[PDB]
A and B are shown apart, each in its own frame.
Chain A
């Protein structure tokens, strides 16, 4: 998919 930033 994309370029994004996770958050867990």
Chain B
């Protein structure tokens, strides 16, 4: 169907694709001459013909792939109809002809590119698929489901009474390949189509579930694993679909995992299946005692699968303190238990968990005594809500095993005491130190095995992290003499652990470690002067001891230590110990670090200038790129991109250190500000492939400015920085980042002061604010038959801050710009999060009688809000009514005095949750009483009074005691005073001057007696107040 010349030109080109020369010439020819408005359809026509008809595998394959790629880019929609049709017809004839399997696969994928919403109907495809599904050739059946997977909309197009049997036969097909493709197609439908379409295939789920036992009958567990993977996707999409056969699937996964002649894939995916219900349907799991019971049971079974064929654990005793990556099911079981416990709570799982543990702790099989320890370790955090109270009980089970004949059970027990020191902190440190420490300490002796000494030393890190110096104090000498022994090990990992454990114990001990400094420090210096991680962990230990004992003591070895660092730095795991150590010395040395900046800063400057290392990449070339932990690939705007992730993580780390030097050294860091701002902070906002970088760029901004301030350029840099921040608001996709930019502007404004913004900036900020609010609304009006966002609340919380901050810097002038997004604001005002936001904005508006334009638009809702069941709404509401009487005294009276009774009732309240809201109302009424002073029908003020003291909201308290400073005589006097003592002592707020005058009006003895109620500690404060 092409001119014969064109054919062998194109044939030559495509054949050249499979040498540099012949192949590059073809590549240029193709991309520069043939993929153009004029030749595109010829090219597509050619490639479709080759894929359809070529007798050569390679040419057919390549053309199928090329066609697929180019057909998108064209795109297929702007192709002439006569040519689309010819392409379609040959593609279809190719599919139905005799091709090798992999070519049929590629044809299927090519065909899919020719089916489209806007594209003319292709009912010949529909017909071809239906017939192929009945073919006696598996590859035809498989390939048809593949097309239904690529183009799930075709499933909508086929008659419901044809498509139903299609899938039922599919699930039941004698070919495994066909089954997997049927299942894949079936789930893909839900992946791709709206939920309103789901109910139409939903009904097939039981046939699918019913087909599952056949995989175990034929012994086809690998294919079972693949189906489990599809089913895992379906659970995440429509968990409730599973409700009616929930017990059946639970029981099935149970059966699989128990059969331990099966290979791991079926078993791990089956566990995953079970696990994922807790993440997507927690109420469904909780409403069924069976789920919990099965899930605990199976993970306990899998956790025992360790040191197989090695009862002494010889191999484990002889290795380092890392995981044996061969123990896969054991690793999976821990993670699963952990994940479900975190989702379901202890309320639901502790009982079934413990039912088993009581028994496994007592077994003669060591593997089960171990399993017990590791399971508790996995579940402890998730079950803390319950287990935090059964702490003596838990230690009673665990601690007796610390001395188990088997070293792995001992390690296991170490592990639990470690895990729970973290998960029940800080309560466990306070109450079980007397049992935990001796237990761990006893394992440290060189009598025990290296792995056990090491793990006990590790668990002392967990414990130390949350133990006060006073608790650790009596145990230090013993802890230390033991760890020195571990320091003398032959095994690199024991020394490494020893060092870190000492470091962290020293960190917790603080000044209590001063007496150990002289024994430790020289042992450490000797190690250093002599093995990279050793030296690093050693420098880490030295500098953390330094921070513990303080600068004066640290000064006995600082110069020598410093000289060693220098030698070490200028001589890759080590690099990170070095950088943190310098950083810790800066915290010790204070301003005396200044002369070290030339040594420490340059390396960080290099790393923090790292560029977005991106490789524009091809489909195939991307999953093996993905294998590396240090790389990731995404699809951004149509293309495939390879990004070097590690490098960008390192950029962040370096940015964080520069930020922390800047923070501590203030004015002394100024010399670096211009450079870090222009070469690091700002360019980092444009790092669209890594959000950490973007955020780290943002937080660096106000801190850099503030350094330069403390030491005109400042005004330039601020203008540049603010403008890119502002610009970022309207382009930044990620809500979490958007927040950082607003916050960052707030902090910038705070630094730069009065009138730090220009008119265009104020306008460009408004657009940003609006696009941010628009996209929040859109995401939120999306939140069921099939299924059971502080990120949003937090963003709006910060937007409030920036607006307020912008208002303040403009000194009101931002009212003008603020008007344009009033419709936006208004929608919000009339879903609680959006309401609170709107109210908060309006309170800021009134702060700057020019708002009458809107009195009518909001007081109806505000008055409503006053009596809302939600405390946060009442709070913001009352503040608004109070701010009305403060800044707009007269354009508001007809409202403020009526509502005043509402406020006396909202007041009645004094409880943590709403102490704040009732304090705002209290302040709100004091504002009204001020503005319209001798105009009120006065019980009121004596009501108000009984709402004192104000202890929680600071700005409220600030007004109430200002108003109190403008009740007399009587025996209100002790309530007058205490009202103030309480505010002061609670640190919530010259009202003192006023009080002294009242006490002046009474004798020596009458004056004194008021403080008679007050304890010593607050009488110390009172003396220093009056």
Give Cα A8–Cα B335 distance, bound, in whole angstroms.
Answer: 9
Give Cα A2–Cα B417 distance, bound, in whole angstroms.
Answer: 12
Give Cα A3–Cα B461 distance, bound, in whole angstroms.
Answer: 8
Give Cα A5–Cα B377 distance, bound, in whole angstroms.
Answer: 8
CB proximity to A under 8 Å, residues B394-435: 414-415, 418-419, 422
Which residues of B are found within 8 Å of A4, using beta-carbon distances? 419, 422
B332-346 vs A, Cβ < 8 Å mask (1 yes, 0 no): 001100110000000
**Nearest CB on A from B366, distance (A):** 20
Q: Is the CB of B418 within 8 A of A2?
A: yes
Closest residue of chain A to B334 (Cβ to Cβ) is A5
Tally the A-B contacts, defined by beta carbons under 8 Å: 35
Q: Is the CB of B335 within 8 A of A6?
A: yes
Q: Is the CB of B335 within 8 A of A5?
A: yes
Q: Is the CB of B418 within 8 A of A3?
A: yes
Which residues of B are found within 8 Å of A8, using beta-carbon distances? 331, 335
Say yes or no for B178: interface residue by CB 8 A criterion. Answer: no
Q: Is the CB of B338 within 8 A of A1?
A: no
Which residues of B are found within 8 Å of A7, using beta-carbon distances? 335, 338-339
Give Cα A5–Cα B415 distance, bound, in whole angstroms.
Answer: 10
Q: Is the CB of A3 within 8 A of B462?
A: yes
Closest residue of chain A to B335 (Cβ to Cβ) is A7
Give Cα A4–Cα B455 distance, bound, in whole angstroms.
Answer: 11
Q: Is the CB of A3 within 8 A of B335?
A: no
Describe A's contact surface by its main secondary structure. Answer: loop
**Nearest CB on B from A7, distance (A):** 6
Q: Is the CB of B500 within 8 A of A3?
A: no
Q: Is the CB of B459 within 8 A of A1?
A: no
Which residues of B are found within 8 Å of A5, using beta-carbon distances? 334-335, 338, 377-378, 419
Say yes or no for B574: interface residue by CB 8 A criterion. Answer: no
Describe B's contact surface by its main secondary structure. Answer: helix
Which residues of A are found within 8 Å of B339, using beta-carbon distances? 7
Say yes or no for B458: interface residue by CB 8 A criterion. Answer: yes
Closest residue of chain A to B374 (Cβ to Cβ) is A5
Q: Is the CB of A3 within 8 A of B458?
A: yes
Give Cα A4–Cα B461 distance, bound, in whole angstroms.
Answer: 11
Which residues of A are found within 8 Å of B462, using beta-carbon distances? 2-3
Closest residue of chain A to B380 (Cβ to Cβ) is A5
CB proximity to A under 8 Å, residues B362-390: 377-378
B442-476 vs A, Cβ < 8 Å mask (1 yes, 0 no): 00000000000001001101100000000000000
Q: Is the CB of B338 within 8 A of A3?
A: no
Closest residue of chain A to B339 (Cβ to Cβ) is A7
Give Cα A3–Cα B323 distance, bound, in whole angstroms.
Answer: 12
Give Cα A8–Cα B419 distance, bound, in whole angstroms.
Answer: 18
**Nearest CB on A from B24, distance (A):** 42
**Nearest CB on A from B647, distance (A):** 22
Which residues of B are found within 8 Å of A3, using beta-carbon distances? 377, 414-415, 418-419, 422, 455, 458-459, 461-462
Which of A3, A5, A7, A8 has the most chain B CB within a 10 Å cutoff?
A: A3
Give Cα A6–Cα B331 distance, bound, in whole angstroms.
Answer: 9
Closest residue of chain A to B338 (Cβ to Cβ) is A5
Closest residue of chain A to B461 (Cβ to Cβ) is A2
Give Cα A1–Cα B15 distance, bound, in whole angstroms.
Answer: 57
Closest residue of chain B to A3 (Cβ to Cβ) is B418
Which residues of A are found within 8 Å of B323, using beta-carbon distances? 6
Give Cα A8–Cα B332 distance, bound, in whole angstroms.
Answer: 9
**Nearest CB on B from A2, distance (A):** 5
Give Cα A7–Cα B338 distance, bound, in whole angstroms.
Answer: 9
Give Cα A5–Cα B462 distance, bound, in whole angstroms.
Answer: 12
Give Cα A1–Cα B950 distance, bound, in whole angstroms.
Answer: 47
Q: Is the CB of B458 within 8 A of A1?
A: yes
Give Cα A2–Cα B455 distance, bound, in whole angstroms.
Answer: 8
**Nearest CB on A from B134, distance (A):** 44
Q: Is the CB of A2 within 8 A of B335?
A: no
Give Cα A2–Cα B461 distance, bound, in whole angstroms.
Answer: 6
**Nearest CB on B from A1, distance (A):** 6
Give Cα A7–Cα B337 distance, bound, in whole angstroms.
Answer: 11
Which residues of A are found within 8 Å of B338, using beta-carbon distances? 5, 7
Which residues of B are found within 8 Å of A1, using beta-carbon distances? 458, 461, 497, 500
Give Cα A6–Cα B418 distance, bound, in whole angstroms.
Answer: 14
**Nearest CB on A from B811, distance (A):** 51
Closest residue of chain B to A1 (Cβ to Cβ) is B500
Give Cα A1–Cα B452 distance, bound, in whole angstroms.
Answer: 14
Which residues of A are found within 8 Å of B458, using beta-carbon distances? 1-3
**Nearest CB on A from B941, distance (A):** 59
Closest residue of chain A to B463 (Cβ to Cβ) is A3
Give Cα A3–Cα B418 distance, bound, in whole angstroms.
Answer: 6
Give Cα A8–Cα B1007 distance, bound, in whole angstroms.
Answer: 69
Which residues of A are found within 8 Å of B418, using beta-carbon distances? 2-3
Which residues of A are found within 8 Å of B459, using beta-carbon distances? 3
Closest residue of chain A to B462 (Cβ to Cβ) is A3
Which of B323, B335, B339, B414 has the most chain A CB within a 10 Å cutoff?
A: B335
Closest residue of chain B to A2 (Cβ to Cβ) is B461
Give Cα A3–Cα B411 distance, bound, in whole angstroms.
Answer: 11
Closest residue of chain A to B456 (Cβ to Cβ) is A3
Interface CB pairs A-B, < 8 A, 11: A1-B497, A2-B418, A2-B461, A3-B414, A3-B455, A3-B461, A3-B462, A5-B335, A5-B338, A5-B377, A7-B339
Interface residues of A (CB under 8 A from B): 1-8
Given A2-B462, A3-B377, output 12 extra A-B contacts at Cβ < 8 Å.
Answer: A2-B418, A3-B419, A3-B458, A3-B459, A3-B462, A5-B335, A5-B338, A5-B378, A5-B419, A6-B331, A7-B338, A8-B335
